[PDB]
Enzyme design. Structure first.
Site, PDB file in Angstrom:
ATOM      1  N   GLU A 102       0.827  -1.186   0.000  1.00  0.00           N
ATOM      2  CA  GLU A 102       0.000   0.000   0.000  1.00  0.00           C
ATOM      3  C   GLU A 102       0.872   1.251   0.000  1.00  0.00           C
ATOM      4  O   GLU A 102       1.832   1.351   0.759  1.00  0.00           O
ATOM      5  CB  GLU A 102      -0.915  -0.024   1.220  1.00  0.00           C
ATOM      6  N   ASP A 133       0.260   5.170   0.451  1.00  0.00           N
ATOM      7  CA  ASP A 133      -0.716   6.190   0.835  1.00  0.00           C
ATOM      8  C   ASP A 133      -0.247   7.547   0.350  1.00  0.00           C
ATOM      9  O   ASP A 133       0.719   8.114   0.867  1.00  0.00           O
ATOM     10  CB  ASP A 133      -0.935   6.205   2.343  1.00  0.00           C
ATOM     11  N   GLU A 175      -3.754  10.633   3.336  1.00  0.00           N
ATOM     12  CA  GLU A 175      -4.617  10.305   4.467  1.00  0.00           C
ATOM     13  C   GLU A 175      -4.840  11.646   5.144  1.00  0.00           C
ATOM     14  O   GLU A 175      -3.874  12.268   5.619  1.00  0.00           O
ATOM     15  CB  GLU A 175      -3.911   9.351   5.420  1.00  0.00           C
ATOM     16  N   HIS A 216       3.868   1.505   2.751  1.00  0.00           N
ATOM     17  CA  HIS A 216       3.648   0.236   3.445  1.00  0.00           C
ATOM     18  C   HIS A 216       4.066  -0.955   2.552  1.00  0.00           C
ATOM     19  O   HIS A 216       3.232  -1.517   1.831  1.00  0.00           O
ATOM     20  CB  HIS A 216       2.177   0.011   3.790  1.00  0.00           C
TER      21      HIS A 216
END
Length: 442
Positions: free
Chosen positions: A214, A216, A219, A230
């Site tokens: 992942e 990001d 956020e 991640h």
């Protein structure tokens, strides 16, 4: 999942731009599909719900295999996008309403390619990804997120023949949290040992989780924002059980296949509290729209190099705004994600560097090289009330201890039952998406 026959699936058209040089872009006629969790699940040859509220029907779904045989997910027609799910498009802008009143709470969606049969896969190494965002109506406890995950382009259809819908029905979701709340995993209902989540009338957790890498990009709400890598070992979609999921509840957060914390650059947490916030004297004013630019730098400046750096800058009302910097005594003033930044900041914060254990920026890059699916979502947080993003985490921690304070929100904020009333009309907008070589999108 089988596909139901009650309603045609009609994704929302969303054009993006693919660019070769600054102001030289061409339209790519993509579309937005709703995640399969939000779909009506009913009997294959009828109208009877297989899932209602936060429970599977035990007669129809005594086992996952029987559930999968008996049940099907159905389509989202155009009228239902706004009326039921709170999704709409105007030109190149996509809007997601948090609560839509029969009452829908949050949404997760994916970008389809121009055929509308596969996710638009982005090979992000040595590229720049850019979009305009409005999070002015999102306050403490809410998150309007834009991110990439290592889903399969067909949602797993080729791997799992019981998955009849594929990307067309928003199937195959996985992320670095290895979530058990995904209703369909590896082509099967995740109905074994299904447990409702208390205080969440729509959601539960099944036996399996679904893990994958992942990235990001965003956020955020109007109070705090973060970008985070991640990696997982491996990066690709992996159904998990037991310790491999790295479940929080069994003390396994750091024992699983994915880096759950990720390596984050969050301006406020990095000790610049004046960079981003809801007002004109913050450097970046979250009460107004702005452009978010992300550059994925490799070791040799080519598509074949290892991922080495996630750079970030912003544009607001024509004003270029460089990223904030890490601001602690004796720590280098990093303004990007690198392996060194991750080691130094996690060292300071006393956070376990699971990012490094999972192969670091290089491993994150391998996911990005294979291609990742774009996710756009709006959600509240039934586990941790979004305190990790926008408050003190842990809530009992001293806010002067580096790493604890992530935003100005009170530690009592973000209770889903409260934010679902108080912020019912919150809407995140993502628009004017642009993708191309480094330096090409503004």
């Amino acid at each position: 999942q089988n596909v139901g026959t009650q309603a045609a699936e009609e994704p929302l058209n969303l054009p993006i731009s693919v660019c070769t040089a600054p102001g030289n872009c061409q339209t790519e006629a993509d579309a937005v599909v709703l995640d399969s969790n939000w779909r009506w699940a009913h009997t294959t040859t009828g109208y009877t719900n297989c899932y209602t509220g936060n429970l599977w029907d035990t007669t129809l779904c005594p086992t996952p295999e029987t559930c999968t045989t008996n049940c099907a997910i159905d389509g989202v027609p155009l009228a239902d996008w706004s009326g039921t799910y709170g999704g709409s498009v105007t030109g190149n802008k996509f809007n997601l309403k948090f609560v839509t009143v029969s009452t829908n709470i949050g949404a997760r969606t994916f970008l389809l390619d121009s055929t509308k049969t596969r996710y638009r896969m982005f090979q992000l190494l040595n590229r720049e990804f850019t979009y305009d965002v409005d999070v002015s109506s999102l306050d403490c406890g809410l998150n309007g997120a834009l991110y990439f995950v290592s889903m399969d382009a067909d949602g797993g259809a080729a791997k799992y023949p019981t998955n009849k819908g594929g990307a067309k029905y928003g199937t195959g979701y996985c992320d670095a949290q290895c979530p058990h709340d995904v209703k369909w995993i590896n082509g099967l209902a995740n109905s074994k040992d299904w447990t409702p989540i208390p205080g969440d009338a729509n959601s539960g957790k099944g036996y399996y989780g679904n893990c994958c890498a992942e990235l990001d990009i965003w956020e955020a709400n109007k109070q705090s924002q973060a970008f985070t890598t991640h990696p997982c070992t491996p990066n690709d979609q992996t159904r998990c059980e037991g310790v491999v999921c790295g479940d929080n509840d069994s003390g396994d957060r750091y024992n699983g296949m994915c880096d759950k914390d990720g390596c984050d650059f969050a301006s406020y947490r990095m000790n610049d509290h004046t960079f981003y916030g809801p007002g004109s004297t913050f450097k970046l004013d979250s009460t107004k729209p702005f452009t978010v630019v992300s550059q994925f730098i490799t070791t040799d400046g080519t598509d074949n190099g290892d991922f080495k750096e996630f750079r970030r800058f912003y544009v607001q009302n024509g004003v270029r705004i460089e990223n904030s910097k890490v601001n602690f005594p004796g720590i280098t003033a990093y303004d990007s994600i690198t392996d060194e930044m991750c080691a130094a900041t996690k060292g300071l914060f006393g956070d376990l560097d699971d990012h490094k254990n999972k192969g670091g920026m290089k491993q994150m890059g391998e996911a990005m090289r294979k291609g990742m699916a774009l996710v756009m979502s709006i959600w509240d947080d039934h586990d941790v009330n979004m305190l990790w993003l926008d408050s003190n985490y842990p809530p009992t921690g001293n806010p002067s201890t580096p790493g604890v304070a992530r935003g100005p929100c009170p530690t009592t904020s973000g209770v889903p039952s409260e934010v679902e009333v108080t912020q019912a009309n919150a809407v995140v907008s993502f628009g004017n998406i642009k993708f191309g070589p480094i330096g090409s999108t503004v």
